[PDB]
Amino acid sequence: MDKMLEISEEAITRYFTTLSQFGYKKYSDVDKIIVLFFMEEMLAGEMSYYVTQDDYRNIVNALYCLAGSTCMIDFPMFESYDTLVHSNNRTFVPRITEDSILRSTED
Amino acid sequence: MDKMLEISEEAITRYFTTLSQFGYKKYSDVDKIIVLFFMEEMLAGEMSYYVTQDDYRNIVNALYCLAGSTCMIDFPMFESYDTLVHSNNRTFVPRITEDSILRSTED
Amino acid sequence: MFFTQEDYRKIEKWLLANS
């Protein structure tokens, strides 16, 4: 994966940063941290060979419940260039004003 | 054993250190100290000849109730190189891109 | 180190076997 490692490193670093500024973090949030690094350990070891694609789907959809749950776990950002409404850069090049039998015609 | 000796010495030394700093130790823990050193002299005396391996199992599994009961008695640490999930350092070396009638092969 | 009864039984039987 190489990204669960980054997310977990960020999460525990933020956890201990809060424990440095403050002396308290919600244990309801420490539970999410615990789930996160347990999954990170399990997927990056000898236990990943039991993972199917359905298992991967379920694991990802369960992990995304942790995404914006706390300040420590944050929504990951991936490299994407898409959107729900894509652009139309096609160009119109008519040929000799030629209509076809029914439709118009281009190059 | 040679280790019940160390645990008993540590426990009673901690007991008298507490009686030096404070002037009181819970007698519910003095009971545990009494049981511990009584067992060690039981096992390092002339009564060590009446013990089977089942008796050894029972004695160890009963002494481990005293392990983290109080600060005087601690969990003993042994020299261990194991874990619940081990590492796979085996290496893969096939023979000139060959296979068996069903599967792959190596040196 | 610690011995049980069975350990002594093995030791003595193995002594007597080779004597």
Add this chain to the structure above:
Amino acid sequence: MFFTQEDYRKIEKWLLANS
């Protein structure tokens, strides 16, 4: 216990030590 042979040899060596 699961005694190895060499341990038995040690035992008889030390017993015949007071031979």
Add this chain to the structure above:
Amino acid sequence: MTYNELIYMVLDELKLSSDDSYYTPDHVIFLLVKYRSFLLKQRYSDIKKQIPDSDYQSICLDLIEVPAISGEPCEGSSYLRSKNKVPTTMMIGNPRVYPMDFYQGEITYISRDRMRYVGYNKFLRNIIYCSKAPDGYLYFKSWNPQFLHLEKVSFNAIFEDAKEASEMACPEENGTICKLEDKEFPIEDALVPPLIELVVKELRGPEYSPKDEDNNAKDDLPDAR
């Protein structure tokens, strides 16, 4: 107003301008801080009233983990204490320890005697406590082991010594102010004329008293020398 304004107002009213004067500005500083504490207790101990923010003052504390008695397995759980000694507070205001944001965090500051028996309630097990121990440091205790990670706090209160808390004051945006004389004196302006009057009355009579002037191996005060 700063220490300089108050000190020099007292001095100018006494007209202690000559450098060859018996009573230096340090006498004035000592008297001003002690009469500050005196006036604050006289005003805000009889019954409970509002303390303005001007009588309050802030310090910066750095916390270090220390053993309860010494390093031993059975000597009890460790504590967190400030690196340096903490000024004594006045029991008249709203003492508060906060994690560098006043409007956030709950680090209770309680009596030293109460702090022995604390945290047994199941819902009070994540609350951090404080009390100035007889050693002079501000010890911290709690049942939630995360507190030991805490590294730096602030402490707002009406401190007994204005000078001691002024020396331990929090750094400002510009930086530290080297001279005590350039720091803000912690008293409300409604209490300043009484303070100046009391200190000037303290030093008026002595200002004109005779001195043992002659160097003759003799006490010359009975003769008004």
Add this chain to the structure above:
Amino acid sequence: MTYNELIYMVLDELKLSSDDSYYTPDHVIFLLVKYRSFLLKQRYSDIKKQIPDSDYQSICLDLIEVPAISGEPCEGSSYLRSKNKVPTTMMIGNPRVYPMDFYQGEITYISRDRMRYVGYNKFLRNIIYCSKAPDGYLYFKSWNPQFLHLEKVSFNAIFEDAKEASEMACPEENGTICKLEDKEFPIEDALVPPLIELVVKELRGPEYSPKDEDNNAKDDLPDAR
């Protein structure tokens, strides 16, 4: 504040600067230590009030097992006691003997008369009790033979003689402060201006009084010599 600051405030209010002065700083220390207890009793004996942390001091004691009377068998159980005589506490504060950690342990400081009869309650047979015997030592008593192993305790109270309890002061981190003048005086600032006023009034009149100054085998005070 330290003994030095209070002492020299009193001296400068009195202008006893020359080495050839009748009233030395030792008179000042004596008067300060007595008037401190006087003021503390006057303020905290009428009705029960909050005592600040400044009025207290911590002494550290080293305990030794001693027979009740002598080495006889039937002379009763043995007691622990401090090696050296202990200062007398005032009855206005919160006396407490603690095992080098104020926030832990239960050693009860009680009256001499009460400690004759303690521990008969079956649930109070493990509580260490303390009192200052007429011998002048702090005696310890309990029904739990573990107490006799105790080696060191610290006692926090508003001691009746600041000099005695300051001499018995506990070792600081840096080390022991040899000179009493460099130790910290035990009083709240709100009681310092009254204390200085009382001491200065006490010695103002005597400061300018005449002396029996002629060496003539005669009393020269009636003549105002």
Add this chain to the structure above:
Amino acid sequence: MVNNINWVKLPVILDRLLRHPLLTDLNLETAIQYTLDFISAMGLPNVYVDKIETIDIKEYRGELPCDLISINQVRLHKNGIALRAMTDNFNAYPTHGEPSFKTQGRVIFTSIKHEKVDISYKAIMLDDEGLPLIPDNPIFLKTLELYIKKEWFTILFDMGKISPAVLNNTQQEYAFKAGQCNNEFVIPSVSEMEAITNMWNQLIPRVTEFRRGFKNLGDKEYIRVH
């Protein structure tokens, strides 16, 4: 209760208290303590959270849930018969009938050796920090405000920092609002009054509601026409 118990956070009560400048030294600690004290003293059953949780009996003893405060009922898992309280003094002690139960600490003493039982108990609605969670009913908030204010002013009056008249007024106001809150949380709503109506008017009395989980307590009693 006519209204609904919408939950809100503890520092709401400190938002209301600290408007009084004489109550600016309160903290979340004091709020927590006096909130628990008030919740227990009023003992309003609508403030606790109803839960059901099954346990297994080893030999006339069973482990009890951690958050339990009061037990509504105990029944048998297989039959559903409810358990009354124990009147016995020699329950599990042999020498040389109707099931019952008894609870002291974290243990439940039942009169059955090896069975599973369902326990309907009440606990506190907790916060994500893990703290008590209070209703937002402004009568409840006001009465808790007055409770905390009354304790604080009692302490001050003990030191002598509050006039006796002020404390007397605070006690009077708190007493009236305590009565108002008790009536607010206990008086039945319209649907609870229908349940009580169906329970009251009964040509053939029903005196066995306890065997069931008081399920048919509010069931309407129908009479066939002839």
Add this chain to the structure above:
Amino acid sequence: MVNNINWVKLPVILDRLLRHPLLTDLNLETAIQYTLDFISAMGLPNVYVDKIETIDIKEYRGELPCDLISINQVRLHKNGIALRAMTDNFNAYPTHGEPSFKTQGRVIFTSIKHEKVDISYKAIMLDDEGLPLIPDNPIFLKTLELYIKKEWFTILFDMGKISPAVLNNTQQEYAFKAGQCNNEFVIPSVSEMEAITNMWNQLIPRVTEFRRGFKNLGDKEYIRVH
């Protein structure tokens, strides 16, 4: 009791007392004494631990357990028949019926020469330290706090260090909370009200539940249909 007795250690009361600056010299030594005084003065049976322990009778006398405070019942180990108070003035004294007993100290004087008897007795729940263990019911905690406060203020008022109005207010508050705690620990639960109801409504009265260990005090009284 509706609520459950969740146990907590004694210094939970010193958590709460020492908030008051006039109670800062209270200690666990004082807490133990005044807590035992309050436990006894209140006499609530739900605060004690129910225990059963068998002893043998040598000759109209038997050794009593160490932690006993009160005896619920005594019965014969073999028959199970319960014992009554001994009205006889000459039990174990001969010259030249229904069994009974009497207990004064560590000795129980039965009317039987040689038999084993079962005693259901009450004791105090202790801590890992040999100290009393108190309920965490905030009503109980508040009432005990007020008891200790009232005693300490009585001492200070005998000294003249407390205004009489302060002590009067403390006594008033303690009296109300003492009544409140007494009712809280006494009023039956729903499961206990089923036992009380089964005892109350009996077409054929049952008047012999003392012979048994009050086992059937609460059983329902079912009449067959004819």
Add this chain to the structure above:
Amino acid sequence: MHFNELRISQDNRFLIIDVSVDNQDYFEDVLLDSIVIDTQDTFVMNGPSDNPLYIYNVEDAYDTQQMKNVRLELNIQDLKVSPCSTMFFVYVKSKGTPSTDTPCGFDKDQILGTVINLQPIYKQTLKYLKEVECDCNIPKGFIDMILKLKAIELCVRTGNYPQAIKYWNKFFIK
């Protein structure tokens, strides 16, 4: 002497044991001696117990460097134990004297390696994640399972196998 792979087969039918002797120069004289298998029922602190589950002597297979490396694949059903609820302890022995230049503490004839089946743990984690998917709340059983697994890890790596079995039997079987 060390383990190369000590794993239970993904098909839950074989228990893989592949032992080897360390490559350093002064175990040239040292060989592999035997393989003794114990479960959570028959374990004893002082080495392998009596009446073990399965004893193996390695001269039997071979007819010397071949004896320095060994590989076993035991059909678990032939051992008459449950592959899912069994914790195997695998001992190995040396029957060989190292040289006189050995650094101290390295000359130890015996080792031990604990084995469990990770499939049930994987299924429990998947079930708890499925629960988490619904309403995005963390079940407390999941955190309890994680922390108890970490407790058994600590017990194993510290050698405190008795309390390790106590936790295993109490939590991951019953």
Add this chain to the structure above:
Amino acid sequence: MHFNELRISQDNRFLIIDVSVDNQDYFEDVLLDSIVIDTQDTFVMNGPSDNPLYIYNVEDAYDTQQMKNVRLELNIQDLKVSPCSTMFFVYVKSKGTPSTDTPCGFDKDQILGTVINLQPIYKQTLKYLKEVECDCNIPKGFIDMILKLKAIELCVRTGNYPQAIKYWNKFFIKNNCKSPTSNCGCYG
């Protein structure tokens, strides 16, 4: 390059290092150059410090399979450092050129691996172990110890060594351990 066995002996004597170049023929030419040991006090962001704790040049020995695989048994007392309160940085430099057509990133002449004594950390964690048994309560000490260890673990695996030093100093620099007795305890 890769690490085969990087460990401190549990008797707190020997810092064990065992390096071996990859067996793939891309890296047949490359050979080990030196072994440099650094601690948290002598660590620099890039490369070994100019004041290391120990240097060992491989080429000052038999010179090819012996050169490709190297092993050390450094005794810690000769290093004048504490086995338990120290975190070692092991740098291995390679001399050679990997043949072309190797995927990039594999041709990293330098490799770094850290070391810590986990036994005292287990000693600390055992104190809070039994909190797992006690239900109704959060095992806060156990969780805190686990997170303390995993902070260092993750910060190491991501290459964020400076914060790893900061966490080690915050948590485990004050670790104690039984110093091994010089007279070799005799057994076998």
